[model samples]
Target: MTEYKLVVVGAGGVGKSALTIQLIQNHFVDEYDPTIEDSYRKQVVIDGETCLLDILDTAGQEEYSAMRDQYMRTGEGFLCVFAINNTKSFEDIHHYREQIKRVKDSEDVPMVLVGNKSDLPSRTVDTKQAQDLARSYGIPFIETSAKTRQRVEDAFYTLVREIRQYRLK
Candidate 1:
């Protein structure tokens, strides 16, 4: 079986923990408790291959910035996440992308730009802008709702596929 190291990152309250928890536990959490840092391991079958996913769910708060580079260095792929209702979270993705490139010493790293909280009634980050940013990075973009469990699996699956493709080359 193959193993993949994936890092989940975004600004505070962007739903990183919610999404990760839902994917692994199949349950939605109601409270928004800030994460310092958490790791989980799960076995998943992707494209007919069984793989172990080592996931790092990082804190989105400013104090966590010091550890960001270290997380970036260890990840094989990344889920660059943002909340659809928060414009600043969307804007901060550029910083995360640049950090990953600098720490990994590669701009072609496998990643998926995710807009979470898609089930929310209001959205500040336009879908078009998110898609454009992902296009510029040459990565896939997706909108997901951790609450409704919509496209939550797709986001991770997409990044895993990208990681596989990158390693194949």
Candidate 2:
């Protein structure tokens, strides 16, 4: 059995949990209550291959700082998410990456730069910025939307592939 630990980091309301829900259950909860919780886990299969993925969805603000080290240690990889429509969310990704590095201790671990909310074009952050940041960090980047089910699986699979490929090297 292959197991991968992943943390989902992004600003509040950026749809990190929504993407996880859609990928694991293939459905979205229209009535999602943000007040309910900040974190959870689920499993999914890609191309008929099963993976037990442990996920951590963090509170986007500083209150979660105390738990940051624990969160990073549990994950071998990450889904550094940001809302495409929010430039701050996009910019904050760098801050999140820095935190990840502080606790995880390496940029070589597979990470997928997730640009969420792809369905809303008008609220988009610069695609070039996302690409540039991912490049700077030496990781793959993808845009996704739980509402549209766009690139959700790809985002997950890309990281899995990278991690697998890394092990081969």
Question: TM-score for each prediction?
Answer: 0.95, 0.86
Q: What are the lDDT scores of the predictions, listed in order?
A: 0.91, 0.78
lDDT string for model 1 (79-130, tens) is: 9999999999999999889988998999789999999999998999999999
Query: In model 1, how large is the Cα lDDT of residue 141?
Result: 100
* Candidate 1 stretches greater than 4 Å from native: 32-36
> Which window of ten consecutive residues has the lowest lDDT sum in model 2?
32-41
Q: Which lDDT value does model 2 have at 100?
A: 75
Candidate 1 residue pairs that clash: none
lDDT of 1 at 37: 73
Model 2 TM-score is 0.86
**Model 2, span 1-169: residue lDDT tens:** 7787767778888888788778767888576455333555555676687877766666674444677778777777788889988888888877878877877777666788998998896866888888898888889989898899999888877877776777787
Task: Extract clashing residue pairs from model 2.
Answer: 85-123
Residue 71 accuracy (lDDT) in model 2: 76
